């Protein structure tokens, strides 16, 4: 398994959430981004 | 003598409420006024395509901030979209008090605004920056309104080819403010850059775009970076500094690279013509993954003379260095190039865009400068010398010299004093020594005989954060103390936010709480009436970029190192229920890509929010109407009014 | 430019903890300065006892 | 007529440089100057005698530095300072006292066990935080107060660092031991640090139970939420089940709640349990919800591992039940305000247990536009413009956190009195400064603002400003003012000499309307970031590409001032966390220094003499203008 990207899902969060990731078999340094879209706090990106 | 003021943003964005501030000036205590305010098309007919909003004012409450909706249905009904030339709509405030009291010719008072069609924000994301031909492309687009909350409106995305031809179009009905889609690049697609756009269906000019490069590539194994010793070369005839570079090779997973670096030098002009030196090449091994190379002055001058050129011609040229290292004994080769090593005649820079212009006489004039290294981070501790010549007020001009060392981020605020009856001020700024960076600025004093001036002083000259109160000191200079209150207002993201009334004392101080709806900048406009004429001043404050309205912390507790197939615990935390849009990307893609393609970070979001603003310049004006026009208002009391905007972009 | 760098080597102990080195410097020209704690997290995965 | 002025610190110290500021106003030519100091009771002898000449080039500004020898010829010891200003003479009697220094004791841990070694260092400094070679006695005392170890050390040639070690026997008194250190010369000042001996305890794993809030609000429908955290001694988390039970506590009787027993799964190493308000109300069978105020709750948790049968217990007793959790105070506000000009406040909001609050909005009552947010240290800074009359100003501050009602919010009221004009002349001076924290290397713009009748404005050509730091007089100067200008900005550089908060006192003098003399003065207190004059950073010399492994070699890099002496110690970080009561930090050191300032009133006084005396200054002129003599060595209580 040598993908160039993974984890393209959109998971809701109820003030907290823990996700388990199975790292693919590539030998690199993955950068994981993430956004937010809340009806009462607007958009907010997160540090990769 | 009694007057009814009227303030509104210069540009109307259809389908978004308009912040209209009304004010009552010089009214007897026994008079209570009531009326309505509405939009109006001047051409078709006086057909108000906006819900009339009522307002009531009195002596104790002489101002009121109204929100005036401009729905799409009514705006389309009045023929605002059937106008031939000029997207201009009028705003009218009608009240029977005008005719009864002032005995005016007509009881209609308003301004000529300029509507637009932009609305809301759209952000597009793709799977990866650079794609192989014939590879699937996954993109998602988020939609928000001007309030920065998620929106359920309908957009129409469209992909574009490298030549500019449309390739795919779609229309969506978002119930969750996110739209995801996949499409396949044709297998024979030529290399280029594709663009994906997305606009609101109703709003013609509400588009937003992203780009992704298409190129045939194989993902690399290690990255090569060339770092100059200094980001500049001094070509001053006095001396030429040393030219030294460090080339580093690093595998993607961190370990250094063993190999041989082959480097070639040459000249490169802004046009794009490269002239290599047939010689001066370097072939050195890599120790710890880094190799240190340099070009001596003697060999460089010999190479220049062999090219039939002198060191005087190095004005706009830059030294171009290309490297192609070969890993050993793996055999894989990778290349890197540098196109940012300019030839300069001064190692510093000056940015006087923060300094105001045409400021009031009788109060200190603050010169604000941002000394920055040539292609580098802002400097600190670099002395700045200012020679300010106050031109002839009636006598010979007088000069002043002030020196101050930059503190941090290069900011320097030098309070040059200016006398009354000044004619003009000439400013000569020199940063650093030796080889200083020189800038000039000329300021013209306002015409004499004015009704006074207003001086807005900021005790702290640093960008406020979010949640910190800000204090400004209002004072009236060269005027008669006949009034009783200072009237001030705030303008953030192109809409009036706050409007208050502060009593007049000696050095009146106003406190504004920097909330989350004022970022990333705002305009503070204050004024007062000296008899029958307004005296106004403005000021721009840049809120420091920091955290969001909410929060999102993706944290993986533990060491960075891992092994393939391991299980990783990823924690997500917010302040409410949110739709986290996750994505994990390889890093070798950046190395593969020829050009940098930065992702969506908070800088882009902040630029998106403030791109709706109408303010222009750092503030200040020769009169009240000029101040309001620079701020982005539309003032009309009955004797003065601001002419309509000629185009959306300030000159 | 006023900063003096000294490289000192230490032998980590055999405890699976997170040490916090505390440094305080004394100088006759400027006085006493207290450095921030430095965290060294010692970790291991397989232990045979 | 020329007026000659003399300015000097309120209290002079022996064997330390002292600066004396000399001035001549409306005096032509140059004037020779001779300043002498004698004994107060009889002027028997001269402790010091300096001379200088005031030239018109420097606007008759002069500073003469003298050192008072430790002769100890006589006995609150006073000395009279007499300055001959040409023919004229001005005399002022100033109090004298000597300060010894400071001792800082650093212990690696605060909780030991019988058998372990106690390692402690003594740092010797003077009033300027510089190493000094003295003789210091160090004692170790058990809880009963019986000195078990006594040592006499000399820090000379040791660069101000004294290392010491003590070996705890296997059978010692259990309690709170103390370490006492004092200089031999002045045994009246003893500096103490305390630790505990305790007994050997070592659980299988560590569990921490704490609520999200620091109290409980009765009308909070969400209930009380508690976060149970568990982790092994080697770092990895715990996965198991926790049994939690709550309970009220009416003073000393625990009416445990049976219905609140819950079982929760600890996954990832952290859990969460909520106590419903209905359960708590029904537990005490009381219909009145307000009756539970003052009855603190407690939580007992029992964590059970999932693999074996290991069990550990945790508790968190004393969660108050309060309806007005936040209490509000003033900290560093002046008490005298110049009428018609802005007045700066400062507010401190604290939790029921006495800890500073965080992100609690505050706001003055009736203005609504002067809001702010409480910072990390509990300080919220506001400004309110003052009325133009001379009636006293009453200012009220209230916290505006949304959860509580209006009647339950904190409120504090303060009254300020107007600055007293000399002859009802309505002449004032105002200094406006930024109300934030500065850093060395930054530049500060102080706005000198002047208000008076437009008939004597042209008779003022300058302002004189003095900077007070660490009690001593830092620097002085002049601010030339072009006639016709009301506001004049002084660009003031900030260096490492300003590291603890300094004070700026400015004044101008002019002939009165009637014909007498006039002195108008103002002052401000400015706080800058507390950090060492130098720098000291410890990092990893080796490439950061591996987590440290047991027993392997690691390379450290220390960067600091050249020629300095660096001392190290490594701690577990399990005892560092619980040491929050008192740690050796730069902020604590600078606070210890700041506790010995000459002046204590923040920024103003009733008269010009009040302004000069509050800042820690004296001012005597050839005319009948002078500040009242100070005889006490500590100003009255706050
Ligand atoms: C929107 O489209 C216009 C042309 O209609 C284009 O000039 C503009 O740059 C676009 N705006 C973006 C991409 O933000
Ligand atoms: C004292 O005078 C000396 C003269 O060299 C000057 O350097 C110093 O700054 C002065 N101090 C004060 C407090 O005026």
């Amino acid at each position: 398994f040598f993908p160039e990207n993974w984890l393209w899902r959109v998971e809701t969060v109820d003030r907290f959430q823990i996700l388990t990731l199975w790292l693919p078999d590539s030998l690199t340094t993955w950068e994981i981004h993430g956004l937010s879209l809340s009806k009462t706090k607007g958009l907010c990106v997160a540090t990769p | 003598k009694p007057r009814l003021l009227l303030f509104s943003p210069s540009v109307v964005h259809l389908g978004v409420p308009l912040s209209v501030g009304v004010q009552l000036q010089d009214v007897p205590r026994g008079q209570v006024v009531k009326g309505s305010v509405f939009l109006r098309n001047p051409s078709r007919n006086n057909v108000p395509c906006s819900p009339k909003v009522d307002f009531t004012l009195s002596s104790e409450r002489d101002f009121a901030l109204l929100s005036l909706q401009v729905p799409l249905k009514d705006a389309k009904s009045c023929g605002l979209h059937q106008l031939l030339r000029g997207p201009e709509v009028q705003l009218v405030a009608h009240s029977p008090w005008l005719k009864d009291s002032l005995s005016r010719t007509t009881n209609i008072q308003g301004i000529n605004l300029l509507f637009s069609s932009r609305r809301g924000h759209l952000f597009l994301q793709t799977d990866q920056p650079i794609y192989n031909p014939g590879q699937r492309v996954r993109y998602r687009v988020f939609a928000l309104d001007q309030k920065m909350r998620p929106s359920t409106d309908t957009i129409t995305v469209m992909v574009e080819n490298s030549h500019g031809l449309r390739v795919r179009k779609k229309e969506v009905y978002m119930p969750s403010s996110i739209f995801q889609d996949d499409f396949v690049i044709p297998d024979i697609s030529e290399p280029g850059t594709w663009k994906i756009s997305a606009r609101f269906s109703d709003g013609l000019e509400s588009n937003s775009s992203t780009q992704f490069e298409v190129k045939k590539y194989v993902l690399p194994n290690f990255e090569v970076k060339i770092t100059p010793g200094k980001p500049y070369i001094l070509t001053v005839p006095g001396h030429l500094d040393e030219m030294q570079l460090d080339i580093q090779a690093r595998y993607i997973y961190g370990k250094p690279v063993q190999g041989v670096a082959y480097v070639r030098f040459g000249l490169l002009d802004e046009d794009g013509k490269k002239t290599f030196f047939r010689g001066l090449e370097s072939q050195t091994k890599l120790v710890n993954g880094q190799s240190h190379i340099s070009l001596s002055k003697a060999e460089f001058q010999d190479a220049l003379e062999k090219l039939n050129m002198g060191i005087t011609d190095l004005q706009g040229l830059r030294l171009y260095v290309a490297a192609a290292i070969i890993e050993s004994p793996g055999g894989e080769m990778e290349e890197a190039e540098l196109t940012s090593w300019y030839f300069v005649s001064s190692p510093f820079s000056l940015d006087l865009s923060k300094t105001k212009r045409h400021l009031v006489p009788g109060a200190p004039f603050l010169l604000q400068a941002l000394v920055r290294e040539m292609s580098g981070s802002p400097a600190s501790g670099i002395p700045v010398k200012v020679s300010a010549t106050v031109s002839s007020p009636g006598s010979v001009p007088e000069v002043q010299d002030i020196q101050q060392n930059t503190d941090g981020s290069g900011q320097v605020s030098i309070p040059i004093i200016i006398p009354q009856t000044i004619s003009e001020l000439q400013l000569s700024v020199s940063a650093g020594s030796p080889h200083p960076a020189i800038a000039r600025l000329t300021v013209a004093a306002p015409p004499s005989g004015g009704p006074g001036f207003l001086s807005i002083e900021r005790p702290d000259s640093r960008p406020p954060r979010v949640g910190d109160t800000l204090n400004l000191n209002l004072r009236a200079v060269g005027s008669g103390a006949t009034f009783s209150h200072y009237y001030y207002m705030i303008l953030s993201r192109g809409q009036i936010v706050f409007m208050n009334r502060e009593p007049k004392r000696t050095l009146t101080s106003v406190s504004v709480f920097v909330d989350h709806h004022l970022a990333p900048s705002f305009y503070f406009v204050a004024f007062y009436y000296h008899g029958d004429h307004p005296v106004a001043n403005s000021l721009r404050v840049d809120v420091q970029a920091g955290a969001c309205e909410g929060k999102l912390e993706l944290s993986v507790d533990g060491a960075k190192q891992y092994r393939n197939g391991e299980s990783v615990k990823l924690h997500l935390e917010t302040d409410s229920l949110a739709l986290v849009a996750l994505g994990a990307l390889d890093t070798a893609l950046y190395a593969a890509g020829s050009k940098s393609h930065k992702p969506l970070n908070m800088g882009k979001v902040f630029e998106a929010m403030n791109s709706y603003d109408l303010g222009c310049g750092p503030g200040g004006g020769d009169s009240a109407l000029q101040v309001f026009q620079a701020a982005g208002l539309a003032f009309s009391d009955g004797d003065q009014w601001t002419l309509s905007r000629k185009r959306l972009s300030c000159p | 430019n006023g900063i003096s760098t000294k490289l000192m080597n230490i032998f980590l102990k055999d405890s699976i903890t997170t040490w916090e080195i505390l440094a305080v410097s004394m100088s006759d020209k400027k006085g006493i300065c207290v450095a921030d704690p430095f965290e060294v997290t010692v970790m291991q995965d397989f232990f045979i006892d | 007529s020329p007026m000659y002025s003399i300015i000097t610190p309120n209290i002079l110290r022996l064997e330390s440089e002292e600066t004396m500021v000399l001035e001549a106003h409306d005096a032509q030519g140059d004037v020779p100057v001779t300043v002498t100091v004698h004994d107060f009771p009889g002027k028997k002898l001269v402790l010091s005698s300096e001379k200088t000449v005031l030239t018109p080039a420097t606007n008759h500004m002069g500073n003469v530095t003298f050192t008072i020898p430790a002769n100890r010829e006589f006995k609150n010891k006073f000395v009279t300072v007499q300055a001959t200003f040409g023919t004229q003479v001005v005399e002022k009697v100033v109090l004298v006292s000597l300060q010894s220094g400071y001792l800082f004791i650093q212990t690696d841990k605060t909780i030991y066990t019988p058998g372990s070694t106690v390692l402690y260092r003594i740092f010797t400094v003077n009033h300027k935080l510089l190493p000094v070679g003295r003789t210091v006695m160090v004692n170790i005392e058990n809880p009963e107060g019986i000195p078990v170890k006594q040592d006499s050390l000399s820090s000379q040639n040791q660069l101000g660092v004294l290392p010491l070690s003590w070996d705890i026997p296997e059978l010692v008194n259990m309690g709170q031991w103390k370490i006492r250190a004092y200089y031999e010369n002045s045994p009246q000042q003893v500096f103490s640090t305390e630790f505990e001996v305790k007994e050997y305890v070592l659980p299988s794993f560590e569990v921490i139970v704490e609520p999200t809030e620091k109290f409980y609000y009765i009308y909070n429908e969400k209930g009380l939420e508690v976060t149970i955290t568990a982790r092994f001694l080697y770092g990895k988390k715990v996965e198991g089940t926790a049994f939690v039970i709550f309970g009220i506590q009416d003073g000393e009787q625990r009416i445990s709640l049976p219905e609140s027993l819950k079982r929760i799964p600890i996954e990832d190493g952290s859990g969460e349990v909520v106590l419903s308000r209905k359960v708590l109300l029904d537990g005490v069978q009381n219909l009145r919800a307000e009756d539970l105020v003052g009855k603190s709750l407690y939580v007992s948790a029992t964590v059970i591992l999932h693999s074996g049968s290991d069990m550990v217990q945790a508790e968190r007793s004393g969660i108050p039940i309060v309806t007005s959790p936040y209490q509000i105070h003033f900290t560093k506000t002046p008490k005298y305000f110049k009428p018609g000009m802005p007045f700066d406040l400062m507010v401190f909001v604290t939790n029921p247990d006495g800890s500073p609050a965080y992100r609690v909005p505050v706001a003055v009552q009736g203005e609504d536009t002067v809001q702010s947010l409480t910072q990390g240290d509990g300080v919220a800074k506001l400004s309110i413009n003052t009325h133009p009359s001379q009636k006293p100003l009453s200012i009220t501050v209230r916290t505006k956190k949304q959860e509580l009602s209006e009647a339950e919010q904190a409120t504090r009221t303060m009254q300020a009195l107007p600055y007293s004009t000399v002859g009802n002349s309505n002449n004032y001076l105002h200094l406006s400064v930024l109300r934030t924290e500065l850093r060395p290397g930054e530049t500060l713009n102080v706005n000198f603002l002047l208000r008076m009748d437009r008939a004597h404005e042209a008779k003022i050509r300058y302002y004189t400003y003095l900077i007070m730091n660490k009690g001593r007089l830092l620097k002085a100067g002049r601010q030339v003012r072009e006639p016709g200008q009301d506001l004049v900005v002084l660009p003031l550089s900030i260096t490492t000499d300003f590291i603890p908060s300094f004070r700026l006192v400015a004044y101008y003098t002019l002939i009165g309307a009637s014909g007498q003399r006039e002195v108008v003065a103002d002052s401000v207190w400015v706080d800058v970031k507390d950090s060492c004059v130098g720098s000291l950073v410890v990092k990893s010399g080796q490439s950061e590409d591996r987590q440290p492994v047991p027993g392997q070699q690691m390379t450290l890099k220390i960067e600091g001032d050249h020629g300095a002496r660096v001392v190290l110690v490594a701690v577990d970080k399990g005892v560092f966390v619980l040491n929050k009561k008192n740690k050796l930090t730069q902020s604590k050191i600078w606070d210890v220094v700041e506790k010995a300032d000459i002046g204590c009133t923040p920024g103003s006084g009733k008269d010009y003499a009040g302004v000069f005396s509050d800042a820690g200054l004296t001012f005597t002129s050839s005319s009948g203008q002078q500040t009242a003599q100070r005889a006490e060595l500590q100003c009255p209580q706050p």
Side-chain angles (χ1 to χ4, degrees), chain B residues 118 195 197 204-209:
Chain B
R118 295 180 56 72
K195 179 161 66 178
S197 306
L204 204 176
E205 307 171 59
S206 41
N207 46 295
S208 186
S209 69

Side-chain angles (χ1 to χ4, degrees), chain B residues 14-15 49-50 70-81:
Chain B
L14 294 164
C49 32
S50 199
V70 59
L72 275 154
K73 155 172 162 263
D74 284 10
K76 175 184 280 263
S77 88
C78 34
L80 273 170
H81 275 58

Side-chain angles (χ1 to χ4, degrees), chain D residues 199-467:
Chain D
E199 182 60 294
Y200 183 91
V201 174
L202 178 76
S204 317
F205 54 95
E206 88 176 17
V207 166
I208 315 272
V209 170
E210 69 202 344
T212 60
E213 260 174 344
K214 304 282 284 299
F215 55 86
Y216 178 61
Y217 187 59
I218 304 106
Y219 302 82
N220 177 23
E221 294 305 289
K222 195 183 169 73
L224 167 67
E225 50 279 30
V226 190
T227 296
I228 294 99
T229 289
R231 61 189 54 265
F232 283 87
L233 298 189
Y234 45 93
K236 312 291 190 281
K237 318 264 216 316
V238 196
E239 318 223 358
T241 59
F243 285 89
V244 315
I245 171 153
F246 300 92
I248 217 161
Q249 170 163 25
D250 175 29
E252 283 273 17
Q253 300 83 328
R254 302 197 172 166
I255 309 174
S256 189
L257 296 141
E259 312 197 309
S260 52
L261 171 51
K262 306 203 86 57
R263 169 177 192 160
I264 56 161
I266 288 187
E267 301 205 353
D268 153 37
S270 299
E272 176 174 52
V273 55
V274 73
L275 173 148
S276 266
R277 169 184 203 265
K278 184 182 171 13
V279 164
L280 174 53
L281 291 204
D282 294 333
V284 292
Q285 78 252 10
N286 274 327
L287 79 155
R288 289 192 46 69
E290 214 210 52
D291 250 16
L292 287 89
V293 176
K295 295 181 177 181
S296 49
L297 311 155
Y298 90 126
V299 196
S300 196
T302 311
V303 169
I304 306 147
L305 251 183
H306 227 166
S307 81
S309 86
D310 276 273
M311 191 213 61
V312 86
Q313 298 193 73
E315 200 198 352
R316 184 64 141 73
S317 48
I319 289 147
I321 290 188
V322 278
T323 203
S324 186
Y326 292 134
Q327 61 202 23
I328 203 167
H329 278 145
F330 292 99
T331 49
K332 301 169 175 297
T333 70
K335 195 179 172 300
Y336 301 92
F337 72 99
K338 286 83 66 174
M341 301 185 157
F343 188 35
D344 170 284
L345 311 92
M346 185 165 325
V347 178
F348 186 28
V349 182
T350 46
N351 270 302
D353 84 79
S355 298
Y358 195 58
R359 260 88 55 81
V360 201
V362 306
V364 182
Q365 197 179 5
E367 287 208 355
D368 158 8
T369 322
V370 290
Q371 304 172 183
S372 178
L373 286 196
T374 307
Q375 276 293 303
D377 273 308
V379 280
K381 301 190 226 237
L382 321 172
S383 91
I384 179 183
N385 53 59
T386 60
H387 51 218
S389 302
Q390 272 190 300
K391 48 177 176 295
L393 187 66
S394 187
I395 37 194
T396 304
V397 288
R398 293 182 57 246
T399 43
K400 292 199 319 180
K401 198 167 185 58
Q402 194 208 139
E403 83 183 340
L404 312 108
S405 179
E406 298 286 359
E408 290 134 32
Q409 301 284 51
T411 167
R412 189 71 56 177
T413 301
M414 144 192 193
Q415 192 171 185
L417 307 174
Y419 166 98
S420 65
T421 47
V422 200
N424 253 290
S425 59
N426 303 309
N427 299 355
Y428 295 129
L429 185 77
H430 179 76
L431 266 80
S432 57
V433 201
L434 85 175
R435 286 292 98 189
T436 71
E437 208 189 77
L438 300 119
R439 300 184 54 252
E442 287 204 8
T443 278
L444 160 64
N445 282 0
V446 189
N447 302 340
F448 296 65
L449 184 76
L450 158 71
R451 65 166 283 187
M452 49 193 303
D453 41 347
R454 283 103 170 85
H456 311 297
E457 186 141 31
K459 333 183 72 172
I460 293 146
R461 296 141 290 151
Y462 50 51
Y463 303 100
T464 299
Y465 75 94
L466 317 102
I467 294 165

Side-chain angles (χ1 to χ4, degrees), chain B residues 26-48:
Chain B
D26 208 322
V27 66
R29 279 164 82 179
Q31 302 293 110
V32 168
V33 317
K34 45 188 78 154
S36 66
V37 60
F38 48 81
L39 274 158
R40 168 243 262 183
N41 203 319
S43 294
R44 196 237 92 91
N45 227 28
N46 313 337
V47 283

